[PDB]
């Protein structure tokens, strides 16, 4: 009914118009490598 001129949102190999960033590199809470000890804590390798 029409070929209306409009925006073709890019689906090609668009490598460099967008920039996925990271500044102040990773900051969040996750401490799941804890192990059991009393005063000298017996932790292992694990978690993050």
């Amino acid at each position, epitope marked *: 009914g029409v070929e209306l001129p409009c925006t073709s949102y890019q689906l090609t190999t668009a490598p460099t118009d967008e920039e996925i960033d990271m500044h102040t590199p990773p900051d969040i809470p996750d401490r799941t490598l804890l192990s059991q000890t*009393a*005063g000298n804590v017996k932790i292992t390798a694990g978690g993050r």
Partner: nanobody
Amino acid sequence: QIQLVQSGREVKNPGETVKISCKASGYTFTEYPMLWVKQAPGKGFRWMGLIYTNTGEPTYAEEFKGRFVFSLEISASTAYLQINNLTNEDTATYFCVRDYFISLDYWGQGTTLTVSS
């Protein structure tokens, strides 16, 4: 040295509380695990919980934590486990542990108390 010095024996009042005082010193009150211990009349040293003591928390178990409720001012190793809300089917031994490598690394003396008001 790991001196989880408990209270002595007991004839514990039904409906009341009895605070077996775990002076858990040299082992962990103020830095290390105070392992809270209910004591079975058959069951032996049963779980009232445990706590690594660098921050200052005691932790509870399923069968001994509950009616036995314990508090802990760990600076002198001070704490007290109340065999409390007493019934005739509530009495047993009691104990603690002074931990390291999350099983206990030293053993505390405990006290045996039979629930009878």
